[PDB]
Each structure stands twice: as C-alpha cells, then as structure tokens.
Amino acid sequence: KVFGRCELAAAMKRHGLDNYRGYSLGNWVCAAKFESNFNTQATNRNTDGSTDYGILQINSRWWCNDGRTPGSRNLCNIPCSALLSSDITASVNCAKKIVSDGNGMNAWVAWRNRCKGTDVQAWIRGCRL
C-alpha cells in the first residue's frame, strides 16, 4: 500500500508512535517518506547482502528474517515479508524496538540526513489527528 501522508500519520499515531521514545509523529512520517515514499512494499538490497523492508526500511541483518541474510539476527522475531503488509503494525512494533536500542532514530539513515534537525511537524500539518 502507498499511504497518504495524513493517513500514515493517523495510523502511526494509533499505533503509539507519537512521541514514542520522545520522537514526535512528524519524525516518523518524515522517516517513512524518505525511506519508502510511504510504500509498504518497498524493498532495497544493501551492499552487505541484507535487505531493507517496508515503510520504515527495516534491515534483515538485525531485525527480521528473510532467509537469505546469513548470520543475521531476527531481533523483531518476524519474517521480513511481514513488514511489507498494508497493515503497518508489524513495522511499527519492530520500529519501536529499533528506536529503543540506544541510537534512537539515527538507525534510519534517511531520518538522520533528511529529517533530523528540520521542521518535522510540517509532515503532519493539516492532518486530522
């Protein structure tokens, strides 16, 4: 599914991402925009052979099992394909684990390079939340 901006904001809010670990909702929307263009089906292969999956581009080296990332951990205990669902629950639940691991949202390179330090509230402006 390709979410609309406000539709994703609302879904993220309902799943408890607003100010999760101190990151306001706009940060999550911004991250999703630049990680996946709001597309739950986005995948991208990394040079190390891992793949990033879903709206938040969660990486199979650490977080999910895709059966082809040797030596990889599945810290979210999910098949990576679950992260492609039109239901963002699994992505959100896994993202909560990632953001809690000590590095915050810096785990998302697009967030660090395109969202961090910017007016991220713009990403939820206008939305009925």
Ligand SMILES: [Cl-]
């Ligand atoms: Cl915000």
Ligand SMILES: [Cl-]
């Ligand atoms: Cl933090």
Ligand code: NA
């Ligand atoms: Na992979």
Ligand code: NA
């Ligand atoms: Na994801």
